[PDB]
Amino acid sequence: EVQLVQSGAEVKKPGASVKVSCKTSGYTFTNYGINWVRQAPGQGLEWIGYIYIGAGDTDYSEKFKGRATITSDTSASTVYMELSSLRSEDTAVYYCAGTGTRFVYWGQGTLVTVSSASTKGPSVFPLAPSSKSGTAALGCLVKDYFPEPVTVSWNSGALTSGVHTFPAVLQSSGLYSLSSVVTVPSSSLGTQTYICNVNHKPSNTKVDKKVEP
Amino acid sequence: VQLVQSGAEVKKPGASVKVSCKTSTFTNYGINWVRQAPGQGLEWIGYIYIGAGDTDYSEKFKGRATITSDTSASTVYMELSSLRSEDTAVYYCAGTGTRFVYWGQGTLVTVSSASTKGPSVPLAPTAALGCLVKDYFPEPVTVSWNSGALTSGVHTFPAVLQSSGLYSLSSVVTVPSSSLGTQTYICNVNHKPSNTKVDKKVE
């Protein structure tokens, strides 16, 4: 089977440079052109460049001027994309397309995160029901944490039904923010006590905030 | 040159959807059709070249998918038949052209047996406010605070589909605690598929 395996995810600081690799196993053809494309977290895709393995002809877009350099190793059948002088605006998943003119095969995508931060424990904020909440909703927002992940449980994992933890968003600052909400019968609110257990293993900090009005 | 794709679609299983890529013509271009499932990787449906005129398809979509080009002017279309839940992804058109490959914005095609529901939207305690959206079909929901006025400290997180078949969403804004009591905070949630806009005031 023909598959394209890209390199692992890398977190880089602004002004740094990242080189991503796409190897292609199962294709022993001398015609093996790879196309580079990046998708920003909310945006759609956009082209970076193209390289053909034997003749070695490379081509970049108007966006990247000299921060885009695609290279290839015929022996190891790996193609590499290097993006230099990174900015925070370069945070995206870089895919490699496959075989040639038609994008028949795709790589799993390598996520590159450009952030100026280093490591932060999150500040969790308890969100209790408002004056208009028979179901009521409870939250803890996990604000300002770098990098991921963060695991959030309610009542030490005792409470699972109705608990939804939404995907993290990297802010402009370079920090992740997250929210965890749980919908619970409102009758329970006075007697049942609820705590949002947030764990950020990268910083070794585990905060348990109790939610109540 | 820019490739402009058709609007987002919501269809029921077994239906057919035809997506289009208008361009700034596409003669001698080579348009590929690719779909991305949510959060997942990319998948190729087919390719059509105008001059060579060879249409190529993926064995996965060779029967259900058909790619065509407009007769007059220039426009490319992808129609996929016998829709399934599993076909829910963003369809992307990519035009090679002359030494640049231009991408379309992408079109979201949602395929669920599920039927349109408006959101059930308040969360109160610098403090942190936001209102959490409950089960709602389909997916485009737009949240703002104070009718676009409050855009500082507002973070609206991506939706999550449930076993229910419905999406739930979260919008949180962090505001100075001094303001509570003087500043009034209303979240405006607009779910256009339902023709519904809820304004829930939070304290």
Author numbering:
A (entry chain A): 1 to 133, 137 to 216
B (entry chain B): 2 to 25, 28 to 124, 126 to 129, 138 to 215
Sentences from the paper on this structure:
Herein, we structurally and biophysically characterized unexpectedly occurring human heavy- chain only antibodies arising directly from transient CHO expression. We found these non- artefactual HC-only antibodies to be homodimeric in nature, with an extended interface joining both CH1 and VH domains, and to be linked by a conserved intermolecular disulfide bond similar to how Fabs are linked. Further, these HC-only molecules have similar or better accelerated storage stability characteristics and thermal stability compared to their mAb or Fab counterparts. Unlike mAbs or Fabs, these HC2 species are expressed efficiently, independent of the LC, where one HC domain seemingly mimics the LC during assembly.
To understand the structural basis of HC dimer formation and the nature of HC dimerization, crystallization studies were conducted for the Fd2 domain of molecule A (Fd2-A). Crystals obtained from a sparse matrix screen diffracted to 2.9 Å and the structure was solved by Molecular Replacement (See Table 5 for crystallographic statistics). The final model consists of six monomers of 215 residues each that form three homodimers of HC:HC in the asymmetric unit. In the crystal structure, the three molecules within the asymmetric unit are structurally similar but have distinct and different domain orientations. The final electron-density map allowed the positioning of most residues with confidence. In Figure 6B, the Fd2-A structure is shown in ribbon diagram and reveals a highly symmetrical homodimer. The CDR loops are also highlighted and face outward, similar to how CDR loops are positioned in Fabs/mAbs. The electron density corresponding to residues HC-216 to 224 is very weak, indicating that the loop is disordered. This disordered loop also includes Cys219, which is engaged in an intermolecular disulfide bond to itself in the opposing monomer based on previous studies of HC dimers and our disulfide mutagenesis experiments. Here in the case of molecules A and B, HC dimer formation occurs with or without the presence of LC, implying that perhaps one Fd domain mimics the LC, and can promote folding of another Fd domain presumably associated to BiP. Remarkably, as depicted in Figure 6D, the novel HC2 or Fd2 complex reported herein overlays nicely with a representative Fab structure with a low overall Cα RMSD of 1.10 Å, revealing that the opposing HC, or Fd, likely mimics the LC structurally during assembly and promotes complete folding and assembly of HC2s/Fd2s. Hydrogens bonds are apparent between the side chains of residues HC-CDR2-A-Asp-59 and HC-CDR3-B-Arg-102 (3.4 Å distance), as well as HC-CDR3-A-Arg-102 and HC-CDR2-B-Asp-59 (3.4 Å distance).
